[PDB]
Each structure stands twice: as C-alpha cells, then as structure tokens.
Amino acid sequence: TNGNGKKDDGEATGRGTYLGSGGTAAILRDPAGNVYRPVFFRFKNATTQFSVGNNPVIVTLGQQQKFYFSDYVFDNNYDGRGDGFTVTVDGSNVPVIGAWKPQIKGVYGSRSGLDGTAEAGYGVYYRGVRAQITPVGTLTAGIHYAQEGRDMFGAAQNTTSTPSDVTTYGADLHGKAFGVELHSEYATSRVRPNTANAAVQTSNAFYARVATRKDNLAFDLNTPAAKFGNDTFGVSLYDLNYRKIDAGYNNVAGISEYGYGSYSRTSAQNIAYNPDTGVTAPFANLDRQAYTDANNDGTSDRNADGTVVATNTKIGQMGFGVKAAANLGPVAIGGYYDTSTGANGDNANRMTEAGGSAKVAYSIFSLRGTYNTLDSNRPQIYRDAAGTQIIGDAKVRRYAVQADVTPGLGLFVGAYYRDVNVNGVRSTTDRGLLGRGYLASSFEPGVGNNAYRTGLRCADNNFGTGTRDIDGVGGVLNPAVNLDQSRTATCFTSYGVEAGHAGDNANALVKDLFFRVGYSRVYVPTTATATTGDFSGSVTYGDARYDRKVGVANVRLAGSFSTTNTQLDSRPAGTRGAVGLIVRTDPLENVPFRPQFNGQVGYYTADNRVAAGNYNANATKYGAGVVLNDFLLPQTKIGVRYDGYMAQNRQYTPFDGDGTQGYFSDANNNRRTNLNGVYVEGAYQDLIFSYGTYTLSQKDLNGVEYGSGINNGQPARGQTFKISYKVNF
Amino acid sequence: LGFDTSGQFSQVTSGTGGSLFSTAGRLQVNQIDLNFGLVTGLPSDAYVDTNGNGKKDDGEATGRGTYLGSGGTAAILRDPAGNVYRPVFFRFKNATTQFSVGNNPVIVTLGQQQKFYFSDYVFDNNYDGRGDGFTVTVDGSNVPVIGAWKPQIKGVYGSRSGLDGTAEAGYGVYYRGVRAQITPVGTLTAGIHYA
Amino acid sequence: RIAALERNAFSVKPSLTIGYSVSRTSRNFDVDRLFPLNADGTVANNAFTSGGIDTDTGAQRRDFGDFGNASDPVVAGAAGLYGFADGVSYTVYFTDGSTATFDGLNPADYKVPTGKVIDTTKGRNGFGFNNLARYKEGSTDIGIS
Amino acid sequence: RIAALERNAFSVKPSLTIGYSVSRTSRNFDVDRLFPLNADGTVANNAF
Ligand SMILES: [Ca+2]
Ligand SMILES: [Ca+2]
Ligand SMILES: [Ca+2]
Ligand SMILES: [Ca+2]
Ligand SMILES: [Ca+2]
Ligand SMILES: [Ca+2]
Ligand SMILES: [Ca+2]
Ligand SMILES: [Ca+2]
Ligand SMILES: [Ca+2]
C-alpha cells in the first residue's frame, strides 16, 4: 500500500484478500465437486533503460541510472541515483581529431524520483558533464564537472541533512604509454550545508601512482609497472605513489553513493577499495581511534566480550610509498617503503613501514632472508601481552631465514627461523600488527620465479590450529577439505623443520599420496608480561591423505596428529588425532542382482589440557549401504542404509544469522551422545517407498538419560514413512 | 460466456525419482479424469469452505457475496458508457483418486479413499472406503507348478479417513491386512485372511 | 497464417502431484549430519530432509529438525541437547490475559519485565511446558495447478 | 502444426437469453394437477 516495494508489518497477505486463490483455508468451491480459483495476470519487467539513436550521439532514458565519472567524483554505478537521462557523444570518426577518440558524456536526473518529505532525495537534482581524449597509446586524459542541489521546493520541505548544493570538478589521467603505466586524479569539492547562512566547506583530493591496474579496477602490485633489462640483469618497479586526501572528503563531497573510509582498519588500513559496495578509490580517509567513556565512571567502556569501545574521528591522509626489486641471475633482492599521516601533516598520526628481502637459489637448493618494521604512532587496536585489548602506539621488528630443498620426485624439505620483537620485547606473536600495511612483500621458494609478491610468508611451514568441523570427527570424512594444507596465518617466534610430499606433481614417487610432518619450538616468555624467556613451547604434527581405486572400489583414507604443551591461537594444549576411511563401489555385473556397496568410518580423540580442568573428547562415525539395482521383478530395485554417531564431550553450535555456518567443537559438558538409525528405500517402476526410524540419546555420566526432554528416562525418537510418485502431463 | 479446452489432457506419465538410486522415467501411463475450463461467473450454489469438511455449514460466506460482480442481480460491477465487468475464474473437478502402477503379476494402487473387500464378515469396506493408503495385488496365474490353481495375494495399508480432528473417530487410527487365495477344483475358491 | 496464430497462442501446462506421508517424533532433531558428504561438500540426498539451505544467513540442512511437519531449528546449550535437538521452552502466564515465551530449561531463571506480574494459578506457578512431540497424520495429497 | 495448435486452444461459447414474462395472483396455488398424464407417469409440459 505504501509503494516502497517491501512487505511492511500489517500489510495483508495475497491469499488473505482473494479467498480461494490458494492455501488450505477458504477453499471456494461448489457442491457436485466443482472448485473455483481466480485467474491473475503475472508479469515482471527487467528492462528500465531505453537507448535511442546510433553513433555518434546515443541518448538513454531510464529509471535508475548508473554512471561513473571517476574514482572520487560522481561514481554511482552500483545502484544508481534516480530518474533522468544520459547522453554520450563519441567522436572517433571525424577528420582532424579522429585519431584521439574524443568522447563527451552528459547526465541529468532527480534523486530517487518520487520521495517522501522525510527522505534525503526529496526535490534534489544532479547534473554533470565529462570530456575525454586518448592522445598517445592507452593514456587517457579527461576533465569533468558535477553538481547536485535542492530546488525551491526541496529547500523548504526536505527536513533532512542533505546539503543545499555540492559542486565538484576535477581531472584524471589513466593509461599506459611508452611501456610505463601511470594513474593520477585530482578533485575539488565545495559543500554548502543546509543550515541558514552557513559557510562553504572546501575539500580536495589528489593522488598519483605508477602501478598496474586490472579490468576489475583494483591495483595489482605484483606485476611491474616499469621494467628495465632482462631476466639476467633486470630492475623492476612495482609501485610509486603520492596521495593527499582531505579530512572532509566523503561520498557527499564527491556526489557518490558510498564514502571513502578504510575498507578494514586491521588489514590494508590505507586502502579504500571496497568490493562489497563497489568503491574503486585507491586511498582512504583515515580514522584516529581513542577510548570511550560514556557513563563517565573513570574507566574506558568495553563491550560484553571484553573488546574495547572506540570513537572514530576523521583525519585525512598524506604520504608516499615505493616498492622495487632487482634480479641478478640466481640472486634476487627486494624492498619497500611507505609512510602516512593526517592531512594536516601532524606527526601524531604517523605510521611508517619499511623492509627488504633477499634470495639465492641454485639447482634444487634455496635460501631467503627478510626484515620488517612498523612504527605506528597512530593509535591502533591490538591485544597486549597479558591478553587485554588496548589502543595505542605499536612498534614491530621481524626477521626470518628460511632454507629449502627439493631432492626430486614429490619430496620437499624446509627449515626456518623466525623472530618477532614488538614494543622492544620478544613476543610469541606479532598480534596482527604487521598486517596494517599494504606494501609488505616476500619472495617464493623455487628457481626462476623471482616475483616480489605482496604479503608476508608467515603461513609457510606452519602447523594448523583448526578447531571447527562439519563432519563430526574432525574433518577426516570430508572429501572437500585437505587436512595437510591447513596452516595458521599468525606470525610466531619459532624455529623448526618440515618434510612432506605432493602426489599431484607430474613427477612423484607415489601417485595421489599427500602427507607432511613437522616439529617446531615456539617462544614463551617466563611470565605473561615478562621480558626474558626461552623456546619452551613444542609442537609435533603430521597429516596424510591417499586416494586410490582398487578394482571397482574407490578407497580414500586420511589422518592427522598433534601434540603441544602450549596454547596456540584457539587450540588448547594436549595431544589430538583423527583417522577416516571412505569406500564406494560401482555395481558388480558378475554377481546376482547388481549390488553396489558404500561405507565409511571415522575416529577422533583429543586430550585437552585446558586450565579449567583436563578433559577428554571422543567421536565415532560409521555408515553402510547396499543397493540392489535389479531385484526379483524386472523393474524393481531396493536399498538399505545404516548410520551412527557416538560422541563424548562434544557439541554443535548452530548457524549464526550473520552468515557464519555451524560447526562441531569440544566442550566439557560431561555428556555422551548416541545418534543412529536405519533408512530403507525401495522402488517399483517409478513408485518409491521410503522408510526411516532414528533414535537420539544424550545421557551424562553415571547414566541419567535426557533425550526426551520430559525427564522420563527415555531417548528421543522419530519415524517416517513416505510414498512418492512423480507424474508429468 | 465460457471457455472450454479440448480433451487431450486426460493422460499422465511417470517420472524419475529416488534418493539412494535413480529410476528410469516414463515407465507407466495413467488415465485421469480432469474436466477444467475457464468460467466468467460463479453459480448461486457456490460457497467458501473454511473448515475443510467439504460442506456448506451455517455462517460460511456465499460465493457471490465475496466476489462482487460475479453474478446475481445485486452488486453489478459496471462502468458508465455501458461496460460491464465480471471476474474470470478457473473451474476444475477431478473424478480420479487412484493411481495403479505396474503390470501383471504385481499391481500397486495408491489412492485417497481405498475400497477393498476381504470377506462378508471381515474387513469389508467396499462401499465408501476407509482412508489414505496403498493396495498391492499379486496374481500367480502364470507359474510352472501352481499355475492351474490361480493363487492370489492381496495387501492393504492405510490411515483411517486421512487427516482428522482430535474429536473424530479416525484420528491416529491405522489398518493393515493380507489375504491368500487358491482355486483348486472347479469354481471352488478357498482363502484365508488377516486384519 | 499458422505462424501468426502461434504468436498469439497460449501454451496450457497443467500440473498434478500425488504422494503419501506419515511422520511421528517424540522430540524433533536433525539427522542430516549422519549422511555421507559428497566431494563438493554437500550431504547426500534423502527423503526425510526438511532442510533450508541459505548461503546468505549461513543456514544449512543440518541446522533444522526433520521428523515432524515443522522445521524446528536446533538449539545450542543444555536446553537443546547441545545443538543436537530442538530446545525446551516454557510459556509465561501473566496477569491481565497476556503471555510470553521463555526459551530456557529452568523456569527459576526468568526475569520478570517491569510492569507485569505472573499469575500463579495458571500452570506451574505461571509457567506452562511447551510439548515437543510433532505429528503428521497419514494422508495422501493430490494437488492440481 | 495445426494439431498441436488445436490441442492448446479454447472453444469460446457465448450464450444469450431473451424473453418477457408477467404474472399476477391473489393466492398462489398449483395447476399441474389439471394437465394430462403421459404413459410413463409424468404430467404434460406447460409454460407455467
Ligand atoms: Ca510496504
Ligand atoms: Ca527526488
Ligand atoms: Ca524513491
Ligand atoms: Ca563504483
Ligand atoms: Ca565506563
Ligand atoms: Ca464447511
Ligand atoms: Ca478425514
Ligand atoms: Ca487418520
Ligand atoms: Ca535437517
């Protein structure tokens, strides 16, 4: 009724207004068996634009116009703005300037068309125009002008926070010329607030990069922008940029849909590229965070889970960066640098990161070095040594040395040594502080691949810290999960060694066999907040996986192992192991009927040395099924299926409404579960009979059944019989 | 005015189905009795059945009283310049409720009010039926050793009256049975049954 | 002439459904967690799955009961057998003809909202147990569209 | 092609009625008992 296109509360349902149009209630009928149903006309139009004319001039009239001038100016190609028209003039065919490919765009529209008096788009209109040429190579230059304001009716009844008018103009230069890719953009804005006799606010943005850009409109930073020499003696530049974003620049000042804040405040803090909201701006409008004290008790407010509550103020951004590399035959080196601060240039928001690398690789051997640095004077949210979340300065220094060898076949061996020193003291973990930058880079093992790819290699040769699974036995019965490829991404302070095998390679000792084994020692300080310490931690892990086809049976088995005396990530101390097996067979043509079998079995044990008290968790899952593809009658087949699951000190957390799936996990609830049943299905011609009975019981120790929920000592139960028959006219 | 279609839509064919296995489709053709067509108005006998009992109880609204302009003399939905509007309805009536699948020997029937008859004093429900279920019939006329005795086995399962209220006699009531039969000499037919 | 006639023609496509179903359960719980997992990560199909897969909210077929005619979601904690079955709940009988639902296991842990008082006469001190059994009476359904 | 078109076709059958009638009575009584009885036992048809 209100025209918003959504079902609000109280609006009548479709079947409630037209009785007899569906459902079980209110069947409009007639004695002698007649049944009447109203006839409706259903339609749905997916077209809203109407382009008229042919080249050069094309004019489009639409209902939600999508357009895009530049990154920081007048970018509304995600959902659109409102009702209007768009004109495009292309001058590719013209005598004098036909080689430069001129192009002119024009935009007019009204925000959201009809709007209520309390909506932001009541009596608000926009307009713009952009010119463009492509003089040399791919290098494209252009200028544009944008405008949006209130009319005489909007200025008096809009009752919202939309500014009186916004005027924006700028220029850009994107393309690749003379073997060098260059991107730049300048933009100036003037916003007049809706309040009476208010001053005009001026805010401008500017940046200039030398880097590669994808058709996705996101910068690659892994392919060089400008090179020199060849693979033997080569020097390549990956990035070189300068930026200056004003504090008052946002979506309103740019006449866009979504603002230019940081996509995340923990990873790539300086980057505003948001795939979800379709923001293609390369640089962000930074935030300075601080403690919050609402009730004013003298203590900073914290959430229910212990996370701090922070207040965000908008500072600009102004800094420069660089990233290069150099190949010298076998030896390869790299490096990066990046600094940032507020738009005003104050040193109280400075964050500087720098580092380097090295590599030598002859024949099968390899050797790598690394160094990293963070000097964020800007307040950042991270956990302290004890484990309490804080806000403040952060300094990180990391260096790692990694050796490798590939003696042929699928074999590989690798040893490493890593060291992290946060805030002047040795630490077990860097607490995620090294991820705030966006230029950190490292090499990759091998010979001939000297690419300086972004991202620290903190997840190489590490163990796994997983705790959640969906099959119920730790992931050994899940064909879609590789247990040997699970590696934690946190940067530890450890040294170890790992040996493995990869059966997917063309040359491999055993085909379709994957396994690994390792041993690392983690650094643990004397106390929680002490300075001294030693590598007291110890981890020993091993994984396996083997897929094969023997005869008609496809056999797959997996395994895992772990044993630690320290807590890592969310995984507690103590040993842990799990094994599995899945068998599937094709129908046997040589025996009476045509039976094909199925089966699976899994076991999972875990001794948890948690502080609250040591407990043990168990799991056991099995299955079996026989399908007789040819029963006594010519077109009859039958099948049976038996399943079971025995758990102990395990639980299942259902799905979160935000989008996170459920999982199984250990819990010291002191309860033993036992869920099993049978499933019999048989078909005659195309008529299918389905039967199934199941039973779930959950009794704690000393034997007190809780299945029924009424405390009568009986388990839960279920049964279902179904006859199915599908017909087509 | 009324719209009537042809009678080509009087036969259906089976389709593939199953979970542990997939069956071959188009294995059986079933004859059905559908009489459907578009109508421009409602008769005065129509009503709105809210309780699902299939009868016009007291208080249930009439068909023409809910859809104004669909019939009668009162409440004519018109337009000046003489235009008169009447809603268009879809009328149908199915006289088929059973679906027999398979051929000899074994025939299985799935229906909505199953009619069956074991003997005079036992399990005789061939007048109006009992409820929702299935019936299987096995005929052993063609078989090497006992083909001359014409053996026959019947099977019956169902839920009495299907869905019922808590106060009706058929709420949560299920029946089952089986009967064997031979014809050794002449017309003399002997048999046993269970219910 | 035939081409013009086919342009202004309606393709009549009637539909028909048939099938029988009966289901009984003392308490509604999920059984999709017992079936084998395919290589792509989806559980094997079965005839007793009232599972609503929703990638937007993270819902899966293992998060809902399958034994009644209702898709009762499982409940975490001791109230719902630790995520394995539908959770216990109570109804609260307030004075002046109003009721509220308490979604826990122990009725001695309910907070009374300000401005309301429970009626001790109705139920057990104003708390009525919500039955957990689900029944689908045996019936065959013929649907014509 | 024509056979398929006729399968998915609707047979339009409009109807039309026409007639005049007037009737008066001091008291409503029956007159079907005055008409002859056929051999099958049914009275002869009449317009009233
Ligand atoms: Ca609405
Ligand atoms: Ca508007
Ligand atoms: Ca609108
Ligand atoms: Ca965009
Ligand atoms: Ca406080
Ligand atoms: Ca009724
Ligand atoms: Ca009934
Ligand atoms: Ca019944
Ligand atoms: Ca389910």
Short mmCIF file of C-alpha atoms in Angstrom, two decimals, chain C residues 18-82:
data_model
loop_
_atom_site.label_atom_id
_atom_site.label_comp_id
_atom_site.label_asym_id
_atom_site.label_seq_id
_atom_site.Cartn_x
_atom_site.Cartn_y
_atom_site.Cartn_z
CA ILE C 18 0.47 -37.29 -5.66
CA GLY C 19 2.05 -38.84 -2.59
CA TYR C 20 1.56 -40.22 0.92
CA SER C 21 3.41 -39.28 4.10
CA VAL C 22 3.21 -40.02 7.82
CA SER C 23 5.71 -38.92 10.45
CA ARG C 24 5.92 -39.22 14.24
CA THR C 25 8.51 -37.98 16.73
CA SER C 26 8.82 -37.58 20.49
CA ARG C 27 11.25 -34.68 20.03
CA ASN C 28 12.33 -33.01 16.79
CA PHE C 29 16.02 -33.45 15.96
CA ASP C 30 18.29 -33.39 12.91
CA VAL C 31 19.60 -36.43 11.02
CA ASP C 32 21.27 -34.76 8.03
CA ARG C 33 24.55 -34.86 9.99
CA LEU C 34 24.67 -38.67 9.62
CA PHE C 35 24.71 -38.86 5.82
CA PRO C 36 27.85 -39.07 3.66
CA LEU C 37 29.45 -35.88 2.37
CA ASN C 38 29.99 -35.59 -1.37
CA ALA C 39 33.25 -34.39 -2.93
CA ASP C 40 31.81 -30.89 -3.40
CA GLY C 41 30.94 -30.64 0.30
CA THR C 42 27.19 -31.33 0.23
CA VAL C 43 25.48 -34.12 2.14
CA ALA C 44 23.81 -36.98 0.30
CA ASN C 45 20.16 -36.59 -0.61
CA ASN C 46 17.46 -38.36 1.40
CA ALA C 47 13.67 -38.41 1.54
CA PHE C 48 13.49 -37.05 5.10
CA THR C 49 15.23 -33.66 4.78
CA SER C 50 13.27 -30.56 5.79
CA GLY C 51 16.46 -28.57 5.40
CA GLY C 52 16.60 -24.94 4.37
CA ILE C 53 19.93 -24.15 2.73
CA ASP C 54 20.58 -20.40 2.80
CA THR C 55 24.05 -19.10 1.92
CA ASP C 56 23.03 -15.55 2.86
CA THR C 57 22.47 -16.35 6.55
CA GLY C 58 24.79 -19.36 6.75
CA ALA C 59 21.93 -21.81 7.26
CA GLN C 60 22.48 -25.43 6.25
CA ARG C 61 20.47 -28.64 6.07
CA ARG C 62 21.98 -29.85 9.37
CA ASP C 63 20.56 -26.94 11.40
CA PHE C 64 16.88 -27.96 11.34
CA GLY C 65 14.74 -30.84 12.52
CA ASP C 66 13.41 -33.36 10.04
CA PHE C 67 10.86 -35.62 11.76
CA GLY C 68 7.62 -33.68 12.17
CA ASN C 69 5.84 -31.46 9.69
CA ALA C 70 7.75 -28.48 11.10
CA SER C 71 11.38 -27.46 10.53
CA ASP C 72 12.32 -26.80 14.15
CA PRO C 73 15.83 -25.30 14.36
CA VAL C 74 18.27 -26.91 16.75
CA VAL C 75 19.18 -25.01 19.92
CA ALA C 76 22.63 -24.64 21.47
CA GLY C 77 23.21 -25.32 25.15
CA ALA C 78 21.73 -27.78 27.60
CA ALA C 79 18.21 -26.66 26.65
CA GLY C 80 18.58 -28.16 23.17
CA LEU C 81 20.78 -31.18 23.90
CA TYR C 82 23.84 -29.09 22.94
#
